[PDB]
Curated annotation (Swiss-Prot), chains A, B:
Key word Cytoplasm present: yes
Chief location: cytoplasm
Cofactor binding summary note: Binds 1 FMN per subunit.
Enzyme class: oxidoreductase
Organism: Trypanosoma cruzi (strain CL Brener)
Catalytic residues identified in the record: C131 (nucleophile)
Protein name: Dihydroorotate dehydrogenase (fumarate)
Lineage top rank: taxon: Eukaryota
Amino acid sequence: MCLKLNLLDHVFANPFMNAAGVLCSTEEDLRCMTASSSGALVSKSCTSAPRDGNPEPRYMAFPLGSINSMGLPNLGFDFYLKYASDLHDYSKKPLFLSISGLSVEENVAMVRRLAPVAQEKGVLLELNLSCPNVPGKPQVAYDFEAMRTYLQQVSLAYGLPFGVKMPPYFDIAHFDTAAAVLNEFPLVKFVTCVNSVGNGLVIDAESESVVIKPKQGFGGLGGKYILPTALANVNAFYRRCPDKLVFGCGGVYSGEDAFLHILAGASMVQVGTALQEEGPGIFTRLEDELLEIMARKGYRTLEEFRGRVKTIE
Amino acid sequence: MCLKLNLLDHVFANPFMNAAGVLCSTEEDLRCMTASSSGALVSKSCTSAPRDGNPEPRYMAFPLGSINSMGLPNLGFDFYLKYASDLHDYSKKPLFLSISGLSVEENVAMVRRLAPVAQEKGVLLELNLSCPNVPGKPQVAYDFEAMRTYLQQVSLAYGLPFGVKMPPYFDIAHFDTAAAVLNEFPLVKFVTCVNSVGNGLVIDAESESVVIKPKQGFGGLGGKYILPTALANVNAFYRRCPDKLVFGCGGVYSGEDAFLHILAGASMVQVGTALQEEGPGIFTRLEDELLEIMARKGYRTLEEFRGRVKTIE
Ligand SMILES: Cc1cc2nc3c(=O)[nH]c(=O)nc-3n(C[C@H](O)[C@H](O)[C@H](O)COP(=O)(O)O)c2cc1C
Ligand SMILES: Cc1cc2nc3c(=O)[nH]c(=O)nc-3n(C[C@H](O)[C@H](O)[C@H](O)COP(=O)(O)O)c2cc1C
Ligand SMILES: O=C(O)c1[nH]c(=O)[nH]c(=O)c1CCc1cc(C(F)(F)F)cc(C(F)(F)F)c1
Ligand SMILES: O=C(O)c1[nH]c(=O)[nH]c(=O)c1CCc1cc(C(F)(F)F)cc(C(F)(F)F)c1
């Protein structure tokens, strides 16, 4: 009985990793994830230039999850690249590196430089399609022509297998369109569903106040609020992209949530909010929990039940 | 201290009403809702001809909320028009009538016939914009050209004040676009935010099966999963549509949740999943809980805090 997986020409002890943004910003964070029993890790979505991000408070958590309008604080591409090329211990686990450029050109500039390191060290690219592009247009993955543009240019600039981080969709025609677009691009080998549930609003009753300062309180939603949404997207893309891997991300607190993500068709399982709340010891719990569920049902590998959610008639 | 208010030229004993779809399909249901403490009620969204809906199971509820893909079962517009026309006791409370036709023409044909009875009795139209039109194109409120067309044609055709039921949005540019559209129409006097969080997927771990039979298990989300989404929407529309009312719908299980909806800017507060689960007694508890929070804070009227949510700095 075991959690092991081989995919994208890498070997993974288990299907768990941090989500981009959580416990992956600094060198201290990355060594922490690396020393965790996570099966992998992903570095904070980066821009060309270092970024302070937005004013605090900017993340908050509650029993049902979290809200965030961080404003993409990061140490800049040169730092994550250097982590990839010189600091990371690949004998421990594989590394994903997440880029989240503010324009198609920023994204092109970075991936061009990422290419040789990817080839030689084996770091794996996650391109973030949630990014805003021009303010007043929707984020890139909610604008299918912009998303088309970004994948042609990045596919061209990088010329290696990469993956993509998708915002959730809520309409069947949107699942169909977005997946048709992704299926145009053979080098996109994996799809991560999902990024935050966009622009919710938490209000505190006692103070009669919103709880995060940027954007009049509006922010992305993670955690228990979003599991079903995350499972629907994982499964929508698992079904429409037969030649790609889907990575699940969305309200994982427990081996049981990891179990459903996988039945839905998840290969890797990312933890954002619950990892922020609990800390990296979460990964041993998630492993034993998923193993406990497997034993009870007589599954010995992940691939016995991956993608095998049943329907009614 | 009482929770009375006046709007759209009607008096309400309190801001509470059922959400469309819940306890409002048959004459039995509507009599029940009328005998309740709700300040108002709304009839099941209706089409010209009666409709069986989708195969069962089609609604499931769990501690954090609900998923549904009912398929718009209803007794057809002749029934609800006749309820509005001959059976409803307007001395008891105001009545809203939801219409949700499958095309603009079906919608035009229902509103013209409704108009006379609205004139005569004061039944209030809630036009449901979270309805698909065409298989393959997104639902109507996710297609701003179609949404403009329904608003144009219905406004022409009905020619009295009416309101619309919106699905949630998740992107700031879509709030701006959506609301710019609704502002084109002076007859739209209320906006109900929000309908279900579209196409989520609940999976059951023990049975490894989705839980509703239609749409491969995919369905609209309500309940605790959607409250911050409903709040962001109420507030986004409240701020962008100053000459309209906003009705809030989404995740109201308590007086507290109702209170956050009003601070977000809601005039009326609708209850779906929580009313499905607890029954119409829920209205007495919600009233008392809200009056209690008001008392403790020294609020005498809803007017005093409606739309008064604080931001930081
Ligand atoms: C504080 C915080 C920062 C995040 N930063 C990023 C980011 O930089 N890039 C990204 O693609 N996703 C980011 N996310 C989204 C997570 O990767 C994840 O998609 C989302 O939180 C849902 O997972 P959860 O439900 O486990 O929180 C962030 C989430 C949080 C809470
Ligand atoms: C069983 C069921 C049937 C519904 N039917 C309708 C409907 O016919 N028309 C409509 O506009 N909304 C319908 N809704 C949506 C609700 O009116 C409400 O927007 C949504 O459930 C979110 O509110 P809640 O969080 O209080 O459930 C339905 C919801 C449920 C759960
Ligand atoms: O840094 C973030 O706000 C963030 N938070 C998430 O939950 N997911 C993300 O992918 C990101 C970073 C991308 C991002 C998102 C946004 C948003 F406000 F549209 F959600 C803004 C920005 C930026 F660059 F503008 F600050 C970046
Ligand atoms: O009766 C519904 O399924 C329903 N459920 C909701 O949560 N909100 C609603 O507004 C409705 C009725 C409108 C509706 C929605 C859908 C859906 F699958 F796009 F959500 C389908 C249909 C229809 F007409 F196809 F049955 C109607």
